[PDB]
RNA sequence: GAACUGAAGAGUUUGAUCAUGGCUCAGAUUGAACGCUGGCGGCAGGCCUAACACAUGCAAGUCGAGCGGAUGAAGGGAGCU
């Protein structure tokens, strides 16, 4: 898909005999607004080159999510590193109640009512890791219902 | 047929990084006070401190169909005029 969003641009440095060498890191998310989504990281010596590399990396390794009509299936709670993430479905009139990496990830993924919240560190890359770990494990019915028939598991 | 349906983060320790951890900010509220400024109306509110000391007015009276008593009009008039 093609929906580009830029999350964070940071400037890092390494020390050499002579002084400091600077570089730029960029984090981006891509998706089609209907279930495909992925993130990418890039590094370069200029901001546009890093952004381009991040877009190219993010356009690969895109995954498919299972969403129940512009909203999640069930309340979920994921984590990565020291970051914890909580999301839960909301009514249609609700917006996206989230901040930073949450908002970009969920808006690009195609959901509109997510009402999320994060605990622990708010490092954007770890937050994105945690959010995709949570979203990639959305089961949806007819798959958790592989044990037996349908309309009895619910 | 309703009586509820709802949760955002950021800055700052390093040459740079992740974590831990404190400090600070973005919101809503006052019986508020102070500074600058000030057209109108509706509805409310107005000694949070000294249960400190109080000048002067008013804030608890009524019943003569319970009872003596004294003030006893209007008049009937009479008398002298
Ligand atoms: Mg050497
Ligand atoms: Mg480098
Ligand atoms: Mg954790
Ligand atoms: Mg842990
Ligand atoms: Mg913390
Ligand atoms: Mg902090
Ligand atoms: Mg510095
Ligand atoms: Mg003042
Ligand atoms: Mg004044
Ligand atoms: Mg003034
Ligand atoms: Mg008082
Ligand atoms: Mg006083
Ligand atoms: Mg009186
Ligand atoms: Mg009586």
Arrangement of strands in the largest sheet: 1-2-3-4
**Count of DSSP strands:** 7
- Beta-strand percentage? 25-35%
Overall geometry:
elongated
How far is the N terminus from the C terminus? 33 Å
The small-molecule ligands in this entry are:
magnesium ion
- Sheet of most strands: 4 strands, antiparallel
Figure out the total of helices. Answer: 3
Roughly how much helix do the residues carry, as a percent range? 10-25%
Mind telling me the C-alpha Rg? 18 Å
Topology order in helix (H) and strand (E) letters: EEEHEEEHEH
Structural class assignment = alpha+beta
Q: Would you mind describing this structure in some detail?
A:
The radius of gyration is 18 Å and the shape is elongated. It has helices spanning 47-59, 101-109, 124-136, and strands spanning 4-16, 19-31, 36-44, 63-64, 76-80, 83-87, 117-120. The chain is 23% helix and 33% strand. A 4-stranded antiparallel beta sheet has the order 1-2-3-4. It is an alpha+beta fold and 154 residues long. It binds one RNA strand of 81 nucleotides through residues 11-15, 19-20, 22, 81-82, 86, 88, 90-91, 93-94, 96-100, 102-103, 115-118, 121-123, 126. Residues 2-65 form the S5 DRBM domain. Belongs to the universal ribosomal protein uS5 family. GO terms for molecular function: rRNA binding; structural constituent of ribosome. This is Small ribosomal subunit protein uS5.
């Amino acid at each position: 898909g093609y929906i580009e969003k830029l999350v964070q641009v940071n400037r890092v440095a390494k020390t050499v005999k002579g002084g400091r060498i600077f570089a730029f890191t960029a984090l981006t998310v891509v998706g089609d607004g209907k279930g495909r989504v992925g993130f990418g990281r890039g590094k370069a010596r200029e901001v546009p080159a890093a952004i381009q590399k991040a877009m190219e990396a993010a356009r690969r390794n895109m995954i498919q999510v299972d969403l129940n009509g512009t909203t999640l299936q069930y309340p979920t709670k994921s984590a990565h590193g020291a970051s914890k993430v909580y999301m839960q479905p909301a009514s249609e009139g609700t917006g996206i109640i989230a901040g930073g990496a949450m908002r970009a990830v969920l808006e690009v993924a195609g959901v509109q009512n997510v009402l999320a919240k994060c605990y622990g560190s708010t490092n954007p890359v770890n937050v994105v890791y945690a959010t995709f770990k949570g979203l990639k494990n959305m089961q949806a019915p007819e798959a958790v219902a592989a044990k037996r028939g349908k309309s009895v598991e619910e």
